[PDB]
Symmetry: C2
């Protein structure tokens, strides 16, 4: 098998006015498209080096694998974390865990926003689930480094703070992007990942 | 493919008094043995992950692959860079290149000493050849990060500054270890690696 660019589950303009059609179309059809292709290229190179036992080449491929592989993991999740049917607050057991672990829904939003704005350079903000501790956890990740691969936390909600995700519309004012994106969060999807975490 | 621990080109005591037999035995039969075994286990997990397209697992395995993979690369080179017949100064084209790029042999030693002593924590000092620039270059690497895999430079001479390489004999006094190791440098091996770069 090879990786494929997943279609967006909605129209490019479905998230307006919070994220405009130009960003969505570029962020999916150009950026993510490149990560999948580069990911498949790196995996093939990594396969040849492994068959040859060329460990030097394997390690030299690690930055491309983490960046483009992480890109595929993160963005594929990101599209499902957003929806025109999104916004508002989650329900049921996820809403209860958020209040228990962060005090309230608004406190959680403040913490994830602060983590996302606090990224200096490129990276991501994540809400995750800690299997060992059995509760939610917020983390920030540099560049395309994916949450679970580098921290073991299971991703529930990611916020792409790469400049290409918002600069066209919001320019340098990243907090304006963070303010707007809460209105299109697909809490239905995020709830599925949370419920999938417990057994 | 199954990597294997290469036999040492000499007995564990052949580098005394500069590196004592206990260090050599532990550094080869324990530390390096673990890198090969851990490298093989990590490589086997990669084959499964690649076959499954599990990119998260590939990225999670990267720290173990670089540390143990790099360990295998570096230590395998390190042993050949040392010899009971070593020490003194190189000759021929290697010596002529060292004088040109670093001013003199003694000046070269000061620069490689300073790079090796300057490593805070675990890492390596390397003399390398820059193929693109066509000259020698000194660099430091953190942990077991290998020179070529992370910098593209071809390794000519490596100095292990992990504490397990000198602490038993020299304790915290790494500069005494660095001074002593010059007595067992296998310049014949370093010359072969250098001449191989100008094919
Ligand atoms: Mn992005
Ligand atoms: Mn070592």
């Amino acid at each position: 098998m090879k990786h494929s660019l997943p279609d967006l589950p909605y129209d490019y303009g479905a998230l307006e006015p919070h994220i405009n059609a130009q960003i969505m179309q570029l962020h999916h059809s150009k950026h993510h498209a490149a990560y999948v292709n580069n990911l498949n290229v790196t995996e093939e190179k990594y396969q040849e080096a492994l068959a040859k036992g060329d460990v030097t080449a394997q390690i030299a491929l690690q930055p491309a694998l983490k960046f483009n592989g992480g890109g595929h993991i993160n963005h594929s999740i990101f599209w499902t974390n957003l929806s025109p049917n999104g916004g508002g607050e989650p329900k049921g057991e996820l809403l209860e865990a958020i209040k228990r672990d962060f005090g309230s829904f608004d406190k959680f939003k403040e913490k994830l926003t602060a983590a996302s704005v606090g990224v200096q350079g490129s990276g991501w903000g994540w809400l995750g689930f800690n299997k060992e501790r059995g509760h939610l956890q917020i983390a920030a990740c540099p560049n395309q480094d994916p949450l679970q691969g580098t921290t073991g936390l299971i991703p529930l909600l990611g916020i792409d703070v790469f400049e290409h995700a918002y600069y066209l519309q919001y320019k340098n004012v990243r907090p304006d992007y963070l303010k707007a994106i809460w209105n299109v969060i697909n809490w239905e999807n995020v709830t599925e990942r949370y419920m999938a975490c417990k057994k």
